[PDB]
Amino acid sequence: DPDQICIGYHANNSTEQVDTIMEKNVTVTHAQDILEKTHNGKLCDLDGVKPLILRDCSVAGWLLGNPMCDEFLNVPEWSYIVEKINPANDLCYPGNFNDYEELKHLLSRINHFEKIQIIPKSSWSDHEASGVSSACPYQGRSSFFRNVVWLTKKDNAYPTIKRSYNNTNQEDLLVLWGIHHPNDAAEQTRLYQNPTTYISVGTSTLNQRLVPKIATRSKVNGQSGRMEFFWTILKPNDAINFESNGNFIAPENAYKIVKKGDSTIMKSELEYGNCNTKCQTPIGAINSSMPFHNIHPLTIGECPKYVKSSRLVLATGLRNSPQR
Amino acid sequence: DPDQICIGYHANNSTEQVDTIMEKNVTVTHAQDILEKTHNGKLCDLDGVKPLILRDCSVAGWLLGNPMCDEFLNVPEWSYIVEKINPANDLCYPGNFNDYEELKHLLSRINHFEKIQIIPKSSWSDHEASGVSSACPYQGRSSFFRNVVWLTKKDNAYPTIKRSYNNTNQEDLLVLWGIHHPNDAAEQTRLYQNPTTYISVGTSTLNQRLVPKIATRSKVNGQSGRMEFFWTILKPNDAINFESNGNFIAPENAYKIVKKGDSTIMKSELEYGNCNTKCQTPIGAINSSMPFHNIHPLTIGECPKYVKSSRLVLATGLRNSP
Amino acid sequence: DPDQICIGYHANNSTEQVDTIMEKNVTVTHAQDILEKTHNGKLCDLDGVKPLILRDCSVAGWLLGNPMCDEFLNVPEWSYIVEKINPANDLCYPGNFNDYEELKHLLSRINHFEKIQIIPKSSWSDHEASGVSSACPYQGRSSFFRNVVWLTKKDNAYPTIKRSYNNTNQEDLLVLWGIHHPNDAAEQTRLYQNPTTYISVGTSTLNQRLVPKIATRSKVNGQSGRMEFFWTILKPNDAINFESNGNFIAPENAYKIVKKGDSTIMKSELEYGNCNTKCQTPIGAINSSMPFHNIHPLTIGECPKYVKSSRLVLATGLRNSP
Amino acid sequence: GLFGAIAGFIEGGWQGMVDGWYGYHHSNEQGSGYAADKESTQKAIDGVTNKVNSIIDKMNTQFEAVGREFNNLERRIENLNKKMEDGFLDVWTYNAELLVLMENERTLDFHDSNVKNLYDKVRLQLRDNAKELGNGCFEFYHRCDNECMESVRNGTYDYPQYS
Amino acid sequence: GLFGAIAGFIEGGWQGMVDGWYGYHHSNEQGSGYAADKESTQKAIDGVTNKVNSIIDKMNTQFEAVGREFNNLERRIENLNKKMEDGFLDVWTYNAELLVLMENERTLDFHDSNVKNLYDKVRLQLRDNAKELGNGCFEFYHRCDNECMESVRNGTYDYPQYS
Amino acid sequence: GLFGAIAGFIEGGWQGMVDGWYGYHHSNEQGSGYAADKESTQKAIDGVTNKVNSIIDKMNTQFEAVGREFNNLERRIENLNKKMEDGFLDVWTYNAELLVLMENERTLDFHDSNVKNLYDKVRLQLRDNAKELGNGCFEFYHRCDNECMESVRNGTYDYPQYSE
């Protein structure tokens, strides 16, 4: 019965496992998971600011004002933009948006537009401004883009247009306009009278002169004609000058860039989730204090760091071997 | 006299050396090399599939049908494509191939074409279709690209051309055409009659109107004129529409994209090696179970991971001291 | 009182601290700083070769010969090029330089040009060649770029220009030309007589035909007209051919590329420092034997490796006791 | 493990010691019980906590993928973009997984070392005054009361007093 | 080495032990013989095998260069492409080389630790019944036959009997 | 530290030993004094020097940023360029910082190990002839002069002679 002192270490009922280089599944007394693996599956407000959910509209359909996209005529400030992979409501009248991807890039740094009328539809005296197409229906009637104007001849005449707009606002202005590419020579004269036409556009930096391209093309949304759209950023105190004797899709409304900051165009099929988050991904929001996550590489907000790992666990305690 | 037991460790005759952070060339009892440093110096079949070895032809020369490239009129399915750095047989008639690199990129995902006729020579009733150049010799006589047609005036007239081709096949179709840029105004009227010409091309997505560029140019392959070539992918059930009143280098043949998968365009001066491999580089094939190799960064097949290392040896045994 | 031997380790007066994973600010007997954190704040010669300091001029103002940039009419060999973030003297006559960034990229591999005449002013017997603009002032009077020539009508006519230059030199030649985009139809006839004009340019590889664009534009540097500039590399033994009936900003001088090597275009507000270095950054030179530095990511010369660290210190000695 | 203590010469851990990571079991005439060594436990807690923080903080400036969009004739740069973003993600996934593996190994060995050091601390204190059983226990030659046991744990055991 | 056993208090290794990485040499009245310790050798074989595989597997998802072509007016993106690909190749070359260097160091130290632990296992078994010479050998005070040698190697040698 | 010697059972270091990293303090009839161990100190200098050289050499082929310029309609590739260059700088900054942290830890434990090994080297020589105090010192039973002290440092201590 002599007295004794022993040296030992803690054990418990933990079944937590960690990996090392030389062994896997080592049971430890304590461990710390450092990987967030769950999300709420929703699109939420970011730090109290609601996203712009484009629903069935594309960026092009919104900005040009496809009639199907009237929900988005005057959107409020946003935190990020959500777009579907293939939005149904794009360019109702078939064609293309020149430098479309660069334009979308600019959007990733914009939080709020203020749309303003720059050239009133009423102001066209010597031209018809009511051009419509069945490619752009609204309430079952042929209509047109809301923000630009289809000008055609009046009294078998299309006099040369000379119109200027001076940006007297303190903000940069996004201006949109287009050109119509007709089907044939007869269509050209039927719409615009003049057989040979152009649009010239000038600012302090822009030097554009466009000529319509007549070509035989496949029907798209019921039309073989095409519209090609252009954009520019008009600086405060600079003016834009349009000249045309036909095929001109005139600006009506332009966009003041009123708020700039962090934004992104997120590709997602999800709808609005009536929720708030600090960290958003295209497949759901993250509410976590973990340093890492494996939800999705594309995030915005105050987020954990993304890794492709299925599991990340640090040993904190010691090798768990209770006696028996 | 007293009994004794000792504790010890293995030593052997090994001369295998490893490196650590604190010391180099440590002799160990056992080591494991994990770096493949050898290749066979040949271009081989990849898993039983032979590559397309373009020899002295380029992609452009093959696809447009430079007469010097007739070996490649209808190639079979390939595993990868091998092209020389500067292939001598390219655009026989001088000019350029529009978005050529973007086209070559598409090729990196294609394993087989099936070439088909889309506009027969016989359809040209009111134009001459026999145009040739000494820039494109065949058997040393003036000829032309096999897959496109040089249309010129007939009876001092070049009426407006209107042709459509609807892709009724189930595969995507690679369509090629061109424009001829002449030497001067007199050459323009001599070949095409009309002094001011265009080529309009439309599909569901394409809206092109080309106009010839007359300029004074250096002779290349004996000619100062130029041809600029264009391409599009015509989807099943879409149609391509051509209109022109001159300078039109029309499609004759186009390519059905009948097999897509893993492929690449390998730049190499080597030719076919009559061998088979699971892993190919531009300088030779690899046959290895090592996890790493240092042969070449560009590989195709089931390959080890490339590193720039000259040596990678893992210690397995212990320090071996004499 | 009986004898003893003890085992111990070195301690000293060192206050040097290092960090490990498990603890920070460990006092050690010896440490080695491996991070250079200082520079001299100057722009220096790189190993005896002076940089080209463009002062208030851009690359475009230098090459075209903006009259404000006469300091740089014939610069000697350089080690690197320094340009301000926003140089005051760029395109005095407003417009743009086509593929400007691709040109500047080429410059980053050139150390010296020799400027040569390719079309003498004596060539222009049937056109006026004295065109100037208040957009390009020099000594308070309207002037123009030094290296190109503004041709206008003479005796109410502008006959078709045909000019050729053959590169008989052993070096590649950088050739610059421009087109003038006028304000309106009346200006077009006032300057060039011909209402519809072109510039065609041909080499063995270039095939260009430019047409001016009339548009109503804001005044920039007092002018609403615009000039657009173009460039090409003319190979030895190749020739360049220009043709125009108006709006042509003709070459006078071009640049032989005589020395190629490592160079760079550095953006900096700093002036020349009358010093010599082996390693230069945009904010100052580095003279160090440290393996790392945190001065600036963009460097030229024999330099340490850049890292974003504020501190990098290796422990060499042992934990130092108080 | 590397230091031979944990699951080594000390066969197993004690579920009865809920007090800390390392410590003592004593048995004398007054009774028996466990007591955690506060010094080694705290030092280990600090070390491990600092490690967890260090791992998190170094990863701080990780790559952040951004959505970029390209058209049908920008396929080369689209591919470059994708391989670039995938490339950085793979690098940072590797860095995280490897660091955790390597540090988990070091953490387990750190505990093993601390246990061995605690054992030696007692061994060098007691010297000839106790028998070393070889299983982590010491059998005293003299009587050691609760105050005597406390001095061994304190690191103030008085060897000449009992020799 | 870190643990002081290999090329340490045990000066050299044994050519005569072809059987395993660590073990025993005995010399009693019946004669002498080498014998590898199966338990410690196998444990080490497992650890080293797991290590090698982990290294191969962690490097599994690494950058693969892809051939991309660019025209004469695409030099900037051509250079960007080249630097990006070279950039990833340099990162993974560094990773591979460094991991091998670090784990080679750990591997040799692992063997060293295993030898020290083996020696200690035997030291704690024999205790007072044998003299440790300081060269890895123990000199028995009592007679120890071949079966007695085996109980030492087994870990079943009982102290109470020979003291 | 991991090995229990430095700031462990050997409580503090010696200001008095300027001659090397590790060594001995003797005190006999002839006097007292510090003596650095040549073998272990040299081994450590070599190990530490090679480590330093290795760290530098592995970082030798690191990413180098190059100035590239883009126009107003090339913002996407400009941004791609920026993130690529920043990406590699962040990777290599991480590599450099982490490697230094990890190797610093190893360096301190390396010295700790060297001190413990040196102590054991003397322990296994002296055996029964010295009393182990538990603080790094060995109290002799027999008298050990300057020449006897040297044989301990050399590793040529003759145990059978001093048995007594």
Ligand SMILES: CC(=O)N[C@@H]1[C@@H](O[C@@H]2O[C@H](CO)[C@H](O)[C@H](O[C@]3(C(=O)O)C[C@H](O)[C@@H](NC(C)=O)[C@H]([C@H](O)[C@H](O)CO)O3)[C@H]2O)[C@H](O)[C@@H](CO)O[C@H]1O
């Ligand atoms: C008037 C009518 O119904 N005509 C029948 C033919 O249909 C017309 O075919 C033309 C092309 O030949 C156009 O597609 C016409 O569609 C519109 C449209 O976009 O909806 C009609 C618009 O009012 C017109 N808008 C304007 C401002 O001009 C628009 C444009 O002209 C074109 O889009 C420009 O390219 O065209 C369509 O009504 C029909 O083809 C024929 C049977 O083959 O029978 C005609 O009675």
Ligand SMILES: CC(=O)N[C@@H]1[C@@H](O[C@@H]2O[C@H](CO)[C@H](O)[C@H](O[C@]3(C(=O)O)C[C@H](O)[C@@H](NC(C)=O)[C@H]([C@H](O)[C@H](O)CO)O3)[C@H]2O)[C@H](O)[C@@H](CO)O[C@H]1O
């Ligand atoms: C008619 C003749 O023999 N002229 C002699 C000159 O040679 C001709 O020069 C012209 C340029 O003026 C062309 O280079 C001619 O070459 C071809 C060719 O490419 O080989 C001949 C082809 O038959 C012709 N093909 C078609 C479809 O028209 C082709 C094209 O016209 C051009 O390529 C279009 O750009 O031209 C060449 O034979 C010769 O220059 C001169 C001596 O200097 O003597 C002339 O008698």
Ligand SMILES: CC(=O)N[C@@H]1[C@@H](O[C@@H]2O[C@H](CO)[C@H](O)[C@H](O[C@]3(C(=O)O)C[C@H](O)[C@@H](NC(C)=O)[C@H]([C@H](O)[C@H](O)CO)O3)[C@H]2O)[C@H](O)[C@@H](CO)O[C@H]1O
């Ligand atoms: C001759 C004169 O003083 N006219 C007064 C008008 O000023 C002129 O307005 C025109 C535009 O119509 C130009 O801006 C003129 O500026 C120059 C220039 O760039 O400096 C003058 C140059 O001599 C001329 N150079 C050449 C080679 O032709 C140059 C070019 O024509 C243009 O740059 C081409 O785009 O133009 C400017 O002096 C003024 O507008 C008017 C008041 O409204 O009063 C006129 O008397």
Ligand SMILES: *[C@@H]1O[C@H](CO)[C@@H](O)[C@H](O)[C@H]1NC(C)=O
């Ligand atoms: C381990 O013990 C805790 C109580 O301390 C208990 O919550 C847990 O369920 C136990 N685990 C088992 C029984 O698997």
Ligand SMILES: *[C@@H]1O[C@H](CO)[C@@H](O)[C@H](O)[C@H]1NC(C)=O
């Ligand atoms: C332990 O690891 C093995 C692989 O070694 C794995 O298959 C298994 O899922 C792990 N056990 C668990 C998660 O319970």
Ligand SMILES: *[C@@H]1O[C@H](CO)[C@@H](O)[C@H](O)[C@H]1NC(C)=O
């Ligand atoms: C736009 O209007 C302002 C205020 O009248 C004026 O100062 C400026 O010159 C105008 N801008 C242009 C480009 O004409």
Ligand SMILES: *[C@@H]1O[C@H](CO)[C@@H](O)[C@H](O)[C@H]1NC(C)=O
């Ligand atoms: C080394 O020894 C092994 C036997 O263990 C033998 O197979 C091999 O051939 C030897 N190599 C020599 C002596 O070079």
Ligand SMILES: *[C@@H]1O[C@H](CO)[C@@H](O)[C@H](O)[C@H]1NC(C)=O
């Ligand atoms: C290591 O060994 C190789 C091959 O024998 C030799 O070439 C090299 O110089 C050695 N490196 C050293 C000793 O650092």
Ligand SMILES: *[C@@H]1O[C@H](CO)[C@@H](O)[C@H](O)[C@H]1NC(C)=O
């Ligand atoms: C091509 O032909 C198919 C089947 O005849 C037809 O349905 C389709 O509309 C055609 N495509 C075009 C663009 O005319």
Ligand SMILES: *[C@@H]1O[C@H](CO)[C@@H](O)[C@H](O)[C@H]1NC(C)=O
């Ligand atoms: C530290 O000690 C060294 C001599 O070992 C001496 O040269 C130096 O001046 C001292 N530094 C101090 C006290 O700051």
Ligand SMILES: *[C@@H]1O[C@H](CO)[C@@H](O)[C@H](O)[C@H]1NC(C)=O
């Ligand atoms: C340029 O001149 C050389 C020498 O006279 C000649 O051989 C060459 O063909 C010329 N190049 C061109 C394109 O005319």
Ligand SMILES: *[C@H]1O[C@H](CO)[C@@H](O)[C@H](O)[C@H]1NC(C)=O
């Ligand atoms: C040491 O690090 C601490 C935080 O870990 C920091 O506050 C302090 O500035 C550093 N030491 C000194 C002496 O500055």
